[PDB]
Copies of this chain bind each other. A is one copy, B any other.
Amino acid sequence: AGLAGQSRIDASLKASLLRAVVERQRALPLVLADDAAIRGALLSPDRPSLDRINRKLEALATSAEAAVIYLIDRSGVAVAASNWQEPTSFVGNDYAFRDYFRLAVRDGMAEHFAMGTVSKRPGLYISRRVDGPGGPLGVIVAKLEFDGVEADWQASGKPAYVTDRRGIVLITSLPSWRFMTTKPIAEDRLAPIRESLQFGDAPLLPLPFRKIEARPDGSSTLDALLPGDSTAAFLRVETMVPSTNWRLEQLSPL
Contacts and interface: CB of A to CB of B under 8 A. Distances in A.
Interface of A: 24-25, 27-28, 30-31, 35-37, 55-56, 58-60, 62-66
Number of copies: 2
Chain B CB count within 10 A is highest, among A28, A36, A37, A59, for A59
Chain B CB count within 10 A is highest, among A31, A35, A36, A65, for A31
A55 B35 CA distance: 12
A3 B207 CA distance: 41
B66 A28 contact: no
Contact of A63 (B25, B36, B56, B59): B25
Given A27-B59, A31-B63, A63-B63, 20 more contacts: A24-B62, A25-B63, A27-B58, A27-B60, A27-B62, A27-B63, A28-B59, A28-B60, A28-B62, A30-B59, A31-B55, A31-B56, A31-B59, A31-B60, A35-B37, A36-B36, A63-B64, A63-B65, A63-B66, A64-B65
22 contacts: A24-B62, A24-B63, A25-B63, A27-B58, A27-B60, A28-B59, A28-B60, A28-B62, A28-B63, A31-B56, A31-B59, A31-B60, A31-B63, A35-B37, A36-B36, A36-B37, A63-B63, A63-B64, A63-B65, A64-B64, A64-B65, A65-B65
A31 B38 CA distance: 14
A58 B31 CA distance: 9
A143 to B, nearest CB: 13
Contacts of A56: 31
Nearest to A142: B63
